[PDB]
Amino acid sequence: EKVQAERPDTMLGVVCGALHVADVSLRNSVSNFLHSLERGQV
């Protein structure tokens, strides 16, 4: 129908998605690493 409009620029969209995914993964990794440290693990 040629109605796939109102999308952001592909560059900004993919950069944003990569930033969100990486930020979630890094925060979870750091949290679990510190949790392991707190319990006495190395």
Side-chain angles (χ1 to χ4, degrees):
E1 298 180 33
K2 304 183 176 181
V3 298
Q4 298 296 311
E6 300 182 355
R7 298 186 182 181
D9 191 301
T10 306
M11 299 170 69
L12 182 66
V14 71
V15 167
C16 290
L19 283 167
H20 285 287
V21 174
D23 188 68
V24 172
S25 296
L26 291 166
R27 289 178 181 279
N28 289 331
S29 177
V30 171
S31 181
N32 285 327
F33 199 99
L34 190 144
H35 183 67
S36 294
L37 289 172
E38 183 178 1
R39 298 179 287 171
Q41 302 181 358
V42 178

